[PDB]
Design a protein around this ligand. Sequence first.
Ligand SMILES: *[C]C1=C([C])[C]=C2C(=[C]1)N([C][C]([O])[C]([O])[C]([O])[C]OP([O])(=O)OP([O])(=O)O[C][C]1O[C](N3[C]=NC4=C3N=[C]N=C4[N])[C]([O])[C]1[O])C1=NC(=O)[N]C(=O)C1=N2[C]([O])[C][N]C(=O)C1=[C][C]=C(Cl)[C]=[C]1
Ligand SMILES: *[C]C1=C([C])[C]=C2C(=[C]1)N([C][C]([O])[C]([O])[C]([O])[C]OP([O])(=O)OP([O])(=O)O[C][C]1O[C](N3[C]=NC4=C3N=[C]N=C4[N])[C]([O])[C]1[O])C1=NC(=O)[N]C(=O)C1=N2[C]([O])[C][N]C(=O)C1=[C][C]=C(Cl)[C]=[C]1
Lengths: 499, 494
Amino acid sequence: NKCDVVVVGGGISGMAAAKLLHDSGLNVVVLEARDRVGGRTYTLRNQKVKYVDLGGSYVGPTQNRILRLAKELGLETYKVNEVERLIHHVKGKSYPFRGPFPPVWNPITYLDHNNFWRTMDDMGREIPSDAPWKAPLAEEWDNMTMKELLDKLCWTESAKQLATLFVNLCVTAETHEVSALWFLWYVKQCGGTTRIISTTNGGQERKFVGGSGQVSERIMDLLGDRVKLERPVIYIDQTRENVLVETLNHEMYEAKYVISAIPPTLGMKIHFNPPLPMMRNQMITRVPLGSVIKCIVYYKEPFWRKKDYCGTMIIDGEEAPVAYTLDDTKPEGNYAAIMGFILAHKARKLARLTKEERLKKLCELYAKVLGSLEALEPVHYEEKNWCEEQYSGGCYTTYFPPGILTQYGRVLRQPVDRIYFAGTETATHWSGYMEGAVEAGERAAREILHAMGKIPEDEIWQSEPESVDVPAQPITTTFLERHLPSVPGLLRLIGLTTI
Amino acid sequence: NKCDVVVVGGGISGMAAAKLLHDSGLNVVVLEARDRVGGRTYTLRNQKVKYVDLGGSYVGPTQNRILRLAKELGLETYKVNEVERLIHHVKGKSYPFRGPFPPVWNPITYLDHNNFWRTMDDMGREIPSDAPWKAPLAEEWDNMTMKELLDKLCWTESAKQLATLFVNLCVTAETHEVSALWFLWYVKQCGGTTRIISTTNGGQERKFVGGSGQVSERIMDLLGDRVKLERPVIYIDQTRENVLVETLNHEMYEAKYVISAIPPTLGMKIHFNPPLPMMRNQMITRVPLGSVIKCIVYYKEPFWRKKDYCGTMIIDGEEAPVAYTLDDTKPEGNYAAIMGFILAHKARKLARLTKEERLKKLCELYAKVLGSLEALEPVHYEEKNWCEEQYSGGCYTTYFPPGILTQYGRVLRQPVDRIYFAGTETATHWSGYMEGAVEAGERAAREILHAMGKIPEDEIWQSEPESVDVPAQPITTTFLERHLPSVPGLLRLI
Ligand SMILES: *[C]C1=C([C])[C]=C2C(=[C]1)N([C][C]([O])[C]([O])[C]([O])[C]OP([O])(=O)OP([O])(=O)O[C][C]1O[C](N3[C]=NC4=C3N=[C]N=C4[N])[C]([O])[C]1[O])C1=NC(=O)[N]C(=O)C1=N2[C]([O])[C][N]C(=O)C1=[C][C]=C(Cl)[C]=[C]1
Ligand SMILES: *[C]C1=C([C])[C]=C2C(=[C]1)N([C][C]([O])[C]([O])[C]([O])[C]OP([O])(=O)OP([O])(=O)O[C][C]1O[C](N3[C]=NC4=C3N=[C]N=C4[N])[C]([O])[C]1[O])C1=NC(=O)[N]C(=O)C1=N2[C]([O])[C][N]C(=O)C1=[C][C]=C(Cl)[C]=[C]1
């Protein structure tokens, strides 16, 4: 029944919020819909895989909050394999390369590719992390899909193809589904294009030893019986002195404050009294999550390494079920595995098939891309379709269709009386990641601490010391990369000498 | 507890479904979240207005199902006033006109305006009413916003302005918010541009005497205690022999079948066991409703008539709070009133103001457009912001953002085990209107009748005889309108 704060949702954001409040002396209860904690992170354990992340998995430099929390919980990280060559598969042929970016040899194509990535970052510099709708051209950029932006910027099909894959991979949505403003904000708040796509020195550098699901499981261990599993919240009442929170199985909880630590659209599953303010009421119907199937194919050995391939494949084309892979072998060199994402509309299309049918398609693709018959001999297969999850709605995160961020964005983390909002979608740095979940959870908790007169307003948004274990190298640009003209810029330079 | 069918939602769709099933001999229960029936229709009664529709209101020719249902319930219609001239207000000036369409005098602009409306209808002819995702260019048109389509088609700012207002008014959403495929489907399934925008011979021809809320109230009268008010459904369980439906106030209902007669996205308010199939699970997060405030300003007399204005105003520009008005005077000539819509992003912007502040803005606008100081002296004001409604989500209807209709559209009225789907959003003719609500409700009811072996498959989709009271004139095009070139067509000819 009675406590200081009810946290709705037991993912990383909710658990982190509850941990901070618990550590401050407050009585907290976490209400979780599922029979487990972790939400969009899920570690499966069986004898064939030992452990495997079927949801959120990768951490990297600049993600200092998730690194600190996990370290405090006694977790270790290890480096994702990027010793050997990456592969870019384009028009049925594989091109091995090193470094973060696939190489381009055609000089026109090179100018186009260089200008695209640069423009994304240039446009991002105009967007405040904490308030994207305050960008000078906010409305113009928000009334545009990423597809429209790509059509205007990319003068070659090759750049357009790669930019499209980039959008699909970062936000599990089609370029035509998402707002240009939102996507440009999304990349900037992760530290830019290079940081977001990189393994070494980027978002995919590392995983947790034993899986990322341990983050939530271990906070549950600290909180004990304060975490209530299989308690989906159906009803929040704010008309009286104390807030009343009801669950599906008819339990009632009373608190001074509530943290909502669920994806914004899943707020729709709760009936509110009094009704939500108009803007939030409509916002939560306008913010879907992306579509993805995460698939892991297991092999006897990491045979791609013998061919000097790290296991990273960037795969172009409509025919390919998977557009991106990474080596998912354990740090000890055993349980050899390839992790692949089936993205956006392909997740929808290929969900109709059986498990066995999807395994076949993947093996045949990997055999092609890696040039190895060994890819046709899997020892085990695991997969998870996040689109089917009632209490997630999809993965990785919430995307904003055109027109929404400028109209409703302000409302995302605006408190509704005594309900405060966490969840990775409300973060300002690495929103959509486990990092952002920690940021939002701890910020929401501190908003409540301020409301109770326990901390000054100054202390609601706290910065994070850099990790000593996972330090960040700065992102550099060459002189050529900064000053080489665009395609239309080169063409303008031709029309001027001819006068 | 026990019955044959639980209907979730007591709007027109739910009530119509329940009526049909009840008339067939089945035991039905309607579970309604609000303390009233009618949903997106709501008639307010007080001494100052007598009655006024604050939600769905207009009916017209080709809407034969809502007309028949209402007639059976003992309702009458009357004609919306369109005797005098319409007004097009453009760049701070009023242009009186007659007929459905605002006149254009510049020849280049004329060609551009003609080509736009014609193209909309040409494109619509390629889209099947019952399956828009089966259009030959479905994916291409679905991956585009209406804003993109307008940018490509309209060579003049004048056509683009009017096309934009048209989109805002039909679907209470911005051109950049909506899929081109979905919007072109939407217009076609209402019978085309002319049918959808017309008062005389169109969707806005008539209202019900006493209000449209009587449709739902009177079906509730017929059903008696079978309608349960303030019973929001929170939980549907399909794992056992009979379907279990739970409400917020802890009541349990058992049935063989369920009709979901709520806006698709409001399905999110229900927890399902087992979980929904993947496609429906994601669909219901991708389908928002538009934004609108309906406002009615009352006057001593319908003074605009003395100036030979019917009361219809089509008002261009960002500054104008209201883009469209109609005469809302009672058929007897009293309770003089102007109905206006505050659309899309303007609903959001102007919701921050007080009631009195909105009234002032409207009166000053109407004074400008109608050219009368009499507009500055309102006797009464009524309004409703549909954006704030927990159990509606907005108004008039569900719109589809780019990419959604081709990916998830198939799933809209696909049965989930023993749950069947009604609601105006699942209709194939006048979806988004009271007409479509009737179509969908009765179709969903018949799907269940077929599932029980009571009717043949042949009988699930029934056609409707034309109303003798409100007959439809056909939509005609002149030779010139059909064959006059576009702007780029004229330039190609040069
Ligand atoms: C799914 C996914 C996947 C597959 C993958 C991934 C991901 C995902 N990610 C993301 C993450 O995971 C997230 O963000 C997190 O987790 C979040 O958290 P939060 O905020 O907390 O949320 P959640 O989890 O969801 O939780 C919630 C909770 O609550 C609950 N509920 C609901 N409802 C309700 C409830 N309760 C009561 N009542 C009611 N009503 C639920 O149940 C839950 O529990 C990510 N992340 C990171 O960090 N990393 C990673 O890795 C990840 N992932 C991916 O990988 C990503 N990727 C990307 O992006 C990329 C790649 C590559 C390149 Cl080159 C670039 C980019
Ligand atoms: C709002 C609105 C307005 C303002 C206006 C209008 C409208 C609207 N409309 C539409 C109609 O109204 C609709 O469609 C109908 O109503 C629908 O129905 P349904 O389908 O049945 O649905 P609803 O109503 O919503 O119902 C539902 C129910 O359910 C319930 N719930 C929820 N949730 C729940 C429940 N329960 C239990 N549980 C749970 N969970 C609720 O509560 C409800 O009750 C329209 N219509 C027609 O027909 N007409 C008209 O008039 C209308 N309106 C407008 O006016 C339109 N306009 C247009 O569009 C235009 C104008 C001008 C031109 Cl030129 C063109 C166009």
